[PDB]
Ligand binder design. Sequence first.
Ligand SMILES: CCc1cc2c(cc1OS(N)(=O)=O)CC[C@@H]1[C@@H]2CC[C@]2(C)C(=O)CC[C@@H]12
Ligand SMILES: CCc1cc2c(cc1OS(N)(=O)=O)CC[C@@H]1[C@@H]2CC[C@]2(C)C(=O)CC[C@@H]12
Ligand SMILES: [Zn+2]
Length: 257
Amino acid sequence: HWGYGKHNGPEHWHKDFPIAKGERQSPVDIDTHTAKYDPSLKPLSVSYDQATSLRILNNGHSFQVEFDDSQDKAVLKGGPLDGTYRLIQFHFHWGSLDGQGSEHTVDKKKYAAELHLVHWNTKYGDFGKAVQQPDGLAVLGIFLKVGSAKPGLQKVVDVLDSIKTKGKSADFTNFDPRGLLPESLDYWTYPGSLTTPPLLECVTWIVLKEPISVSSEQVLKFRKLNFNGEGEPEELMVDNWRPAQPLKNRQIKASFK
Ligand SMILES: CCc1cc2c(cc1OS(N)(=O)=O)CC[C@@H]1[C@@H]2CC[C@]2(C)C(=O)CC[C@@H]12
Ligand SMILES: CCc1cc2c(cc1OS(N)(=O)=O)CC[C@@H]1[C@@H]2CC[C@]2(C)C(=O)CC[C@@H]12
Ligand SMILES: [Zn+2]
């Protein structure tokens, strides 16, 4: 099955998933000089006050914190988006070294990690139907750099010991994702895809310009997770990022001058 190794990594994915070579694949390099300010972009609205987390899961590629999305609680609206998108989960991508790990890049710069807050367009009724639509998902991407600790991340870091291996989960209630957000909501936006198989072209990407800082110890704990299941040979969960893909016939728009 697909993964991030030499024999099953991103350069192999197109064999099982030919859309890997499609017209709106993600991630991309954000060329800041070529991105254009768009006055038509409505204000961006991140409303997470009623977010209800449930569980944290090692999914074999990364780890994810899942939310109760059976009601309109935590939602993303505005910006480039038409309608309302509901938060279902967040997860991260990260490196084996601080100098790599992000999926998007900014003028070719790679960050240590990238947080993805995944939301689905409520007009499609549930997540599985939404991923079949060109405007089905909105993913808010946030870069992580290594510096000061992010206090709001520590509760996540400390439960990772309980989900070391693939398929392990743990209860994870009352976690507030507002503690993972930078000060500014200035962003770049473009139409793209999921960055793992099945690589569906269903995502409006909204990538924040301002990174959050996390500590070396916090990201080190990400790197102690395992891709493997319990009782299997240990494979450290690191470098679970897809590299930048061709921009093709797309323009990246900026929310800011
Ligand atoms: C990989 C594409 C895909 C993923 C998913 C579903 C359906 C999918 O499309 S498809 N075509 O049915 O396979 C349904 C459940 C989803 C799961 C992703 C992780 C989710 C969102 C959570 O965190 C909790 C609910 C989980
Ligand atoms: C649907 C959003 C999305 C979900 C997921 C990933 C990437 C995503 O796209 S992105 N990076 O936000 O564009 C990476 C790993 C995925 C995880 C969902 C649960 C999965 C499918 C499993 O159970 C095994 C693999 C797990
Ligand atoms: Zn992701």
